Amino acid sequence: EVNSFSGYLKLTDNVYIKNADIVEEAKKVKPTVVVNAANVYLKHGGGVAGALNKATNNAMQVESDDYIATNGPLKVGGSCVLSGHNLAKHCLHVVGPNVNKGEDIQLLKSAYENFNQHEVLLAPLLSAGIFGADPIHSLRVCVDTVRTNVYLAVFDKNLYDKLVSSFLE
């Protein structure tokens, strides 16, 4: 069945978290929407984007390249909706700020606001990893900003454990 999310920990009325690999979750769950941790040029060579793209056998990148060549880049804090290929009905490509590259952390709020157009989403923690932002902060912005139902996948067990502890303080 679609959107079969299993084994999540409910944080708030609409935010859930699991220590899991987002690619494997997308396969198990068959979600309507998977969120990609995109950059403005939809170049999915690394991070979560690379994992999602590889799981689509490069179909996501081919589609994204054609999109960008005609439609131009996204903005930091922005999004677009493309195909979910084999992983979901839709992929919501969301650009969080890359604070490793000096972008404004305040754009992380705008980034999460993109989730509010979709009733339920499977998602990574925005601006983590190669984007360099503090994950405890990202979870707080998620909780404070997203109103629709978001199921967060965090594969690194140590990070998952610190996030749950932070939420429960």
Curated annotation (Swiss-Prot):
Question: What catalytic activity does the UniProt entry give for this protein?
Answer: Thiol-dependent hydrolysis of ester, thioester, amide, peptide and isopeptide bonds formed by the C-terminal Gly of ubiquitin (a 76-residue protein attached to proteins as an intracellular targeting signal)
Residues covered by the Macro domain: 2-169
Q: How does it sit in the membrane?
A: Multi-pass membrane protein
For this protein, the activity regulation entry reads: Inhibited in vitro by GRL-0617.
| Location within or outside the cell | Host endoplasmic reticulum membrane
> What role is this protein assigned?
Responsible for the cleavages located at the N-terminus of the replicase polyprotein. Participates together with nsp4 in the assembly of virally-induced cytoplasmic double-membrane vesicles necessary for viral replication. Antagonizes innate immune induction of type I interferon by blocking the phosphorylation, dimerization and subsequent nuclear translocation of host IRF3. Also prevents host NF-kappa-B signaling. In addition, PL-PRO possesses a deubiquitinating/deISGylating activity and processes both 'Lys-48'- and 'Lys-63'-linked polyubiquitin chains from cellular substrates.
Oligomer and partners: May form homohexamers. Interacts with N protein.
Report the protein name in the record. Papain-like protease nsp3
* Organism, scientific name: Severe acute respiratory syndrome coronavirus 2
